[model samples]
Target: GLSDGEWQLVLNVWGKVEADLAGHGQEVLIRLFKGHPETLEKFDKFKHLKSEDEMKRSEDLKKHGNTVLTALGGILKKKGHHEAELKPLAQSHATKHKIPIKYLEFISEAIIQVLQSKHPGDFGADTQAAMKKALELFRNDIAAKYKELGFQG
Candidate 1:
């Protein structure tokens, strides 16, 4: 659970970037794909995209990023405690998608990197910490479902 101050910071800082979530979301995915090319292979839509420029031009990638970021916003709004809301998505990813938990950490890092780069001054240590805590809670909730679904690690 996020502290009151942490929640405030997370919510307020996130609000600053609410309008350009699509663009910011794309940037987050671009960062992730650049850092982990193997993760790109998981996405059939943009798996064949070999370069950053090609990824940048991919509508499917952009839409996927947008979906991720939108879900993130909803999670944060719920203070990362919406299990009923998250269970189906987690079960699908754990069973149907066969995704590992590491991708969640990668995506969380990518999101934080984008936020920090965009708002260097506002996204200070405390804010970053708050965001990380919130995301960790989100990942833990999903990880629980993954475990229940018999996905190891």
Candidate 2:
């Protein structure tokens, strides 16, 4: 759903956050948990946590945050030409993890929120819209994989 120009715009804004990319990932996870506490229940690494403060101070969470950031960075590296990477990601989540599609949307929103919080000036309205659409494309692609795998959850 994003044009070439739009993807480039997103990449431009994204490049600015390269200095602390991992930190942004941690914040994104925190933001997601803060917004939807129930979502964290699915994560075995975080399921035992009792409070948001605990999550913020978690080394396990930081490791998972890097994983999330790397996954996203892999996709962004290709400027949305990510089908090669998407299939395995979708398959793993659908078959192995059984992650619901809604969580993808939640993560997408949380990522944008972190981007805005960290670099509001660069991730302006246009870039935010572009980023949103780019993430939606990922959601759609992963959903298709879920369907092919016959995963209803």
Candidate 3:
């Protein structure tokens, strides 16, 4: 579990990052797909898009991304009371999508890249470490389903 001090810092940093996401959600989703093109296949609606740029402007792509980001925003907005909400989200993705944990790791790294490029000043070592830890927690929660399904390590 994250410690008291680190968790507070994580919340503060995430608040600032989430603030910067306004009007840029499409760009964030674009870069995420660019860095990991295979991630695009996860969304059936966007799977037909030929390139990342296509997804950058596709209304269908934007809708799914918006829904995902909205859910993420809700969870982040209520930090202290979000655990139960996230449980179903992680469980559903793991079971329904058959998405490997590595893809979640890829998404996390791509998100960090987007944050790093957008606000280089916001990513000091402590913030980076905290974000990595938080992402690991998310991955752990999702991958627990895989473990129960007999995924090795």
Candidate 4:
């Protein structure tokens, strides 16, 4: 499984893909890790438990992770192009996944770079529209990759 940092990187990259295809200016991409204290505590306590118990615990985590990722992707679908605030989106995702903020910031920065690299040459409307369409397609492709990971919830 990918670490939280890696997952954040994926999210950031997705955001960049969206921005690039859309030909939009830089937009903040944030991901928050709002891990549930009680659940995490429980998991920690059972971290060293027996194989069967551990398997069950792992399943719980998987379920939560998939649900959160799916929901985050959905939210991203509704997000408009241009001047979108990533912090709020990240917070919402973090709250759902119970992840930490540090991981979010790391991924967000990666996404910012991706967007900056794809900015328009002269702000032409056609160029901008083409970029947006490209990004939309890219987003769909990336999301399909996630689905292959058993994350199509």
Candidate 5:
């Protein structure tokens, strides 16, 4: 089971990814906390130390980052945007990754943040309208995809 914090994180990250794909450049890096003692120990033992070698370490980090991103993309392809179907996988992903689920709040918040950043002077009226329209399109796309996959809902 994932805590509220972890679920929130996953949804936030997913929302940011979707927002980026939707042409909003408001990408925010997520800060991860090592809450469990065992995970903290591992992070302290391995990730705490800065590598003495810069170039090799940087290359290694880049490679690891790419690998993780690729894996996440594959996961997202399978997960898609069907909320009902994605909920369990989201919970499982959070628990397996040891992240608190409250991050899911990020999903909605990230969009709001991006919209606000884009229209800082306004009170989100335009942004809200855009989101409603976008959500209708999104819902239609999801429904179509579900139908293609022979899903009823």
Candidate 6:
């Protein structure tokens, strides 16, 4: 359950990047994959790709980042601990990509970092705390499906 104020924070900040989600999304992925180089290995198409600058321009990268960011926007807008929207992604990660549950957690890290840095004034402690809770729930659900599909970690 996301508190009222936390939902407000998410809504307010989301407006700033809705039009430019792809850009913000690319930055999130850039900061993520760049800071943690090994994380890129999870992407079969991205496995051969390296370098933050190059990744930022990649069509697949943009599409992937856009998908993640768009989902975050929807989640923020919808406002809850329920991760029903994320089940498809979890299934894809488990079956298609074979991405472990542990790696899926990075999805939260990158989004949070982007939110905090991109909207420093808006993403306060309460907002972060709330999002963390919701994201943990998201991971819990993702982990369940991952194990069901026989993925590791």
Ranking by TM-score: 1, 2, 6, 3, 5, 4
Worst 10 residues of 5 by lDDT: 25-34
Give the TM-score (vs. native) of candidate 5: 0.31
Better of 5 and 6 by TM-score: 6
Candidate 5 regions with alpha-carbon error over 4 angstroms: 1-26, 30-88, 119-123, 129-153
RMSD values, in order shown:
1.1, 1.5, 2.8, 15.8, 12.0, 2.5
Candidate 6 regions exceeding 4 Å error are 81-84, 150-153
- Residue-wise lDDT of candidate 2 within 11-104, one digit each (tens)? 8877765677778778888988888887888798788877777888898888888888877877987876788999899998887777889888
Better of 1 and 6 by TM-score: 1
Q: On residues 32-147, what C-alpha lDDT tens digit does candidate 4 reach at each position?
A: 11222223333353344343334344544445444444444554453433224343443343445444433433333433343445543332344344334433443444344334
Better structure of 1 and 2 per lDDT:
1
Give candidate 2's whole-model lDDT: 0.83
lDDT of 2 at 133: 83
> Which residue runs of candidate 3 sit more than 4 Å off their true CA positions?
20-25, 73-83, 149-153
lDDT per residue as tens, model 3, 99-128: 677877777776677667766777778877
Model 1, residue 26: C-alpha shift (Å): 0.3
**Candidates sorted on lDDT, descending:** 1, 2, 6, 3, 5, 4
Predicted model with the maximum lDDT: 1
Q: Tell me which residue pairs clash in candidate 3.
A: none
* Model 4: lowest-lDDT 10 consecutive positions: 24-33
2 or 3, which is superior by TM-score? 2
- By summed lDDT, which 10 consecutive residues of candidate 2 come out lowest? 13-22
Q: Judging by TM-score, tell me the better candidate of 1 and 4.
A: 1
- Over the stretch 28-135, how does candidate 6's per-residue lDDT look in tens digits? 788778877878877788777766667766998888778887886776676654458666877877787777766657767887888888878667887778778767
Q: How much is 81 displaced in model 2, in angstroms?
A: 2.2
TM-score of each: 0.95, 0.92, 0.79, 0.27, 0.31, 0.80
